[PDB]
Ligand binder design. Structure first.
Ligand SMILES: CCCc1ncc(C[n+]2ccccc2C)c(N)n1
Length: 387
């Protein structure tokens, strides 16, 4: 019953994130392929992606539930084709901003990817499905990652052909999304009131708050983990190591996500326990990622953080899906990702951006670990409040 939609969406998400260009993205548009300077790739190109992500998530959670979650995925698939098509044959920064915009489209519609399956499978499978979905996505990345590595370590494949393989993968993902089964069917203040009815669920607003907050710190860690590794071990070869470790970490997260789907354990009573334990694990790993000036210890801490957070976000998505009791799967997922991106952008402005505090990378992860520890303690003091 649930096997065909789950398998098709898992194949889509695998081929929509099996992107060998992703680990070698910055070298691709900063090397001979595009000849863009590094001060226009991060101060003018990536903020465009962030802004497009915000303004494209804004109509995702509003409209994805109404359109039954397939067109936004199909819009994600087509915009994957546009993103990497302009990433392949678009020179200069004028076209690359448009690509950052379409990648914001694909990332905002990635909310539809997660929320579609809960609108097409019964709640009983919401655990298993969840894991698998998240797992395959993470598997996707690490697959692409390791694939990319081999293509640059054994076949000297140029970054342009890495992006070509990425486009071919997301093209197969678009074809799989075309074959996704269509889910069955089903002023402003009222809409907000509906959101209030959609957010008054049991053990969901707190999982939502974790999603709205912990994933912002996770995305900050994702962005600046390579910079932390460069600070810890300024090695010329470390690059091939760095992304590779991400692969393993992502792979770990994959299996961690694959854990949540596979284990026949009840998160109804262990949801709070899993939240507390693995949020404390994330905080401790982030502190370990910073406090210990050992590159191998930092890699292990990053693997632990990524795997535990992937497990936690899988539990969060599953628990929100079962406890939602409203058809708006992508509204809560979409607004969760939008609020998380808002918090991530705000803490990027303060923590690392020149406009804010501009904290060096040797205290960046200190404050990231402090942020995750604050999140965990908030969910510590919630358990004590429950008593
Ligand atoms: C398709 C090319 C456009 C594009 N590709 C990859 C990223 C990856 N990235 C970069 C910085 C911060 C976060 C993330 C996910 C990006 N922002 N933009």
């Amino acid at each position: 019953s649930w096997i065909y939609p789950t398998v098709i969406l898992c194949l889509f998400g695998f081929f929509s994130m099996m992107r060998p260009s992703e680990p070698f993205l910055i070298p691709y548009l900063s090397g001979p392929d595009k000849n863009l300077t590094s001060a226009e790739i991060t101060n003018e190109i990536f903020p465009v992606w962030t802004y497009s992500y915000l303004v494209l998530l804004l109509p995702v959670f509003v409209l994805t539930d109404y359109v039954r979650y397939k067109p936004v995925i199909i819009l994600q698939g087509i915009s994957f084709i546009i993103t990497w098509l302009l990433l392949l044959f678009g020179q200069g920064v004028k076209t690359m901003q448009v690509v950052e915009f379409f990648y914001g489209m694909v990332t905002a519609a990635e909310v539809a990817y997660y929320a579609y399956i809960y609108s097409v499978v019964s709640p009983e499978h919401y655990q298993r499905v969840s894991g698998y979905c998240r797992s395959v996505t993470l598997a996707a990345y690490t697959a692409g990652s390791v694939l990319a590595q081999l293509l640059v370590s054994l076949a000297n494949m140029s970054y342009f052909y890495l992006n070509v393989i990425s486009l071919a993968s997301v093209s197969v993902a678009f074809l799989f999304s075309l074959f996704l089964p269509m889910p069955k069917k089903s002023v402003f203040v009222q809409w907000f009131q509906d959101l209030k009815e959609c957010y008054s669920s049991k053990r969901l607003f707190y999982w939502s708050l974790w999603w709205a907050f912990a994933t912002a710190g996770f995305n900050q860690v994702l962005n600046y983990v390579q910079i932390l590794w460069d600070y810890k071990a300024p090695s010329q070869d470390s690059s091939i190591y760095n992304g590779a470790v991400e692969a393993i970490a992502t792979f770990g997260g994959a299996v961690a996500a694959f854990a949540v789907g596979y284990v026949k354990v009840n998160w109804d009573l262990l949801g709070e326990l899993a939240l507390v334990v693995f949020s404390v694990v994330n905080a401790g790993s982030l502190f370990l990622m910073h406090y210990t000036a050992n590159i191998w210890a930092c890699y292990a801490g990053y693997l632990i953080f990524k795997s535990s957070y992937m497990l936690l976000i899988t539990i969060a998505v599953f628990q929100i899906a079962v406890n939602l009791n409203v058809e708006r799967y992508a509204l809560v997922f979409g607004i969760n990702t939008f609020i998380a991106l808002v918090i991530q952008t705000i803490m990027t402005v303060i923590v690392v951006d020149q406009r804010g505090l501009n904290l060096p990378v040797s205290i960046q992860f200190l404050v990231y670990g402090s942020y995750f520890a604050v999140i965990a303690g908030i969910f510590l003091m919630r358990s004590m409040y429950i008593t």
